[PDB]
Structure 1
């Protein structure tokens, strides 16, 4: 998948407020193909629905937390290379390490600015040649 306007995003967070910030930011960046999920399980259900080219995910969520969601994606042969950008309030280095090692594409700490989100998505695009 390429970082054109068609790229389909899944935005995962247990708080709609954060999902809403991220969707609106993506729109501003020219990405309108965006769906939401409320937790890791819901997210896996949509991911299984097919078509997604990028995940942005919270960490602390009921049902399945985002570290589990990230690991699950990375271990699944059908989606193991799916970009996953963590966006979370967890700021300790051990958290950043656990997610990095689990294969996170990137990591943004809440609260974040619009410029930061844009910068970190662009870094992932460049890295993967999207």
Structure 2
């Protein structure tokens, strides 16, 4: 893994975005930026050449699964690995996200330890 990979953290709750950014900081990943919704995340990915996306699944403008579908339907962005954040990994939710093309999921509240594990898993 490259500690300098460019990561976009997406969620409507500023406090949560900050917590994720800080946990990533603990793991040595400091090249992190933020978006408050799928609608503001897309243009950042479209013009920013990111390497990884950590998105919450529940957002009011454009939902997490739709951000994922938009990423996968765009020739320029479909390569992007995506980690979804969920309040509970219900089988139905995980199966749908998997069919939509998600790389992995993490259940909140989560720790830096678990985040590290999920990243390794995804980055392969």
Task: Report the equivalent of 2:14.
Answer: 16
Deviations 1:53-89 (A, max 9, x none): 0000001101100000001101110011100000121
Give the deviation of 1:34 after TM superposition: 0.5
Question: Is the contact made by 2:46 and 2:77 (CA closer than 8 Å) also made in structure 1?
Answer: no
For the residues of structure 1 that align with 2:79 and 2:41, how far apart are their CA atoms? 16
Q: Tell me the CA shift for residue 113 of structure 1.
A: 2.0
Runs of 4+ that moved beyond 3 A: none
Paired residue secondary structure (1:107): strand
Alpha-carbon distance, 1:5 to partner: 2.6
Alignment: residue pair count:
124
Name the TM-score, length of structure 2 as normaliser. 0.95
* Residues 1:114 and 2:112 aligned together: yes
Distance in structure 1 (CA, Å) of the matches to 2:89 and 2:103? 16
1:81-119 per-residue CA deviation (whole Å, 9 max, x = no partner) reads 100000121431110111111111101111212211110
Separation in 1, partners of 2:41, 2:51? 13
1:74 aligns to 2:69 (yes or no): no
Q: Superposition pairs for residues 40-55 of structure 1, below 5 Å? A: 40-55=38-53
| Mapping of residues 57-72 of structure 1, within 5 Å | 57-72=55-70
Classify the secondary structure of the residue corresponding to 1:57.
Answer: strand
TM-score of the two chains, using structure 1 as the length reference: 0.90
Structure 1 position 104 matched with structure 2 position 111: no
RMSD of aligned alpha carbons: 1.0
Q: Contact (CA 8 Å) 2:23, 2:111: kept in 1 or not?
A: no
